[PDB]
Amino acid sequence: NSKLKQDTIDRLTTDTYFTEKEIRQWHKGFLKDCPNGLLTEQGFIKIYKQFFPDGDPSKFASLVFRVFDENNDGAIEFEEFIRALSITSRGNLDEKLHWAFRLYDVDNDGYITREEMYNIVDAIYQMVGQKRVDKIFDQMDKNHDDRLTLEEFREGSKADPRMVQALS
Amino acid sequence: SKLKQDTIDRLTTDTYFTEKEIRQWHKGFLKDCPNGLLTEQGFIKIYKQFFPDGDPSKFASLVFRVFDENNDGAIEFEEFIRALSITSRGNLDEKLHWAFRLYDVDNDGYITREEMYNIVDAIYQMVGQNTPQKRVDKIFDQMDKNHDDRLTLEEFREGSKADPRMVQALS
Ligand SMILES: [Ca+2]
Ligand SMILES: [Ca+2]
Ligand SMILES: [Ca+2]
Ligand SMILES: [Ca+2]
Ligand SMILES: [Ca+2]
Ligand SMILES: [Ca+2]
Ligand code: NA
């Protein structure tokens, strides 16, 4: 039951930056590697694993996997895969910033906490084998309430002059 | 060293920063760069702060040369503000072109295989280093649409934007 139907294709050409021919072509590749048409979290991990002889990339992959799976049913189906591919590879600046925020905000309450931050940073190095993170966070955090909204994260990422401190 | 109106006028044309934003970044840049010039040695030490356990001197030097557009061995404010504008606010094509210029070490408008290895190597050094090369080779070959063994900006952008010929590179 892994085939691609026209109505799904047509939904996807509307919602993504891919043409029909392109979605079908990415579908072929996806199926080959994922014959059940579902890609598991460990499956995802194996993928990053190719990249880092160093480290355990597993934490980072889990976090990234968590944003990819829209319905949080433990799998990425093709629709979800192609949605995320389209954003991350062809999306505009603001879309990309939104998706980065969703990743940082693990618990989805619309705030990035110091710990929520520290975890992604921790994940990055772990994948690879601190006054600074605090420095960036604190400049972005314009009301100094230990909390980053989407607006603060967007403005700080787009080099609002508040961030000069954070550079050195 | 004061910021002239002509400089602000060209910078508001060339960048995404408003006049007001340009003057505040200029105050910030000056405080830590009293000379009005950023130096490669200076530029590397900054990188050393983020990467304690690596030697990021090679990566920083590559990045440095993209920033220093006139090639005179220093990053002035105009150079800094333009690279900051591109990397913080650029559309997808503009950021991918900045990426491409980083790879294209000799500035000849092409990325060779060697150029790509040099970049990958420098990241590894920075971070504490079958093979990476095999995996780089796959990406580069898929990117290389016409198989002439070099990459144009058009090939590199197409591949980065997930043209389906990049399937084999992920497989
Ligand atoms: Ca799912
Ligand atoms: Ca949260
Ligand atoms: Ca805040
Ligand atoms: Ca210069
Ligand atoms: Ca070149
Ligand atoms: Ca070529
Ligand atoms: Na402008």
Curated annotation (Swiss-Prot), chain A:
Tissue-wise, where is it found?
In the embryo, highly expressed in the ventral ganglia.
Is Cytoplasm one of the keywords? yes
As a miscellaneous remark, the entry gives: Binds 3 calcium ions via the second, third and fourth EF-hands. Phenothiazine FD44 binds to frq2 and disrupts interaction of frq2 with ric8a. This leads to reduction of synapse number to normal levels and restoration of normal learning performance in a Drosophila model of fragile X syndrome, suggesting that the interaction interface may be a suitable target for the treatment of fragile X and other synaptopathies.
Sorted alphabetically, which keywords does the UniProt record give?
A: Calcium, Cytoplasm, Lipoprotein, Metal-binding, Myristate, Repeat
**Protein name as it appears in the record:** Frequenin-2
| Annotated effect of mutating residue 80 to A | Does not affect interaction with ric8a
Protein family (similarity comment) = Belongs to the recoverin family.
The reported effect of residue 152 to A is:
Does not affect interaction with ric8a
Phenotype seen when the gene is deleted: Increased number of type Is boutons in neuromuscular junctions of abdominal segment 3 muscle fibers and reduced nerve-evoked excitatory junction potential.
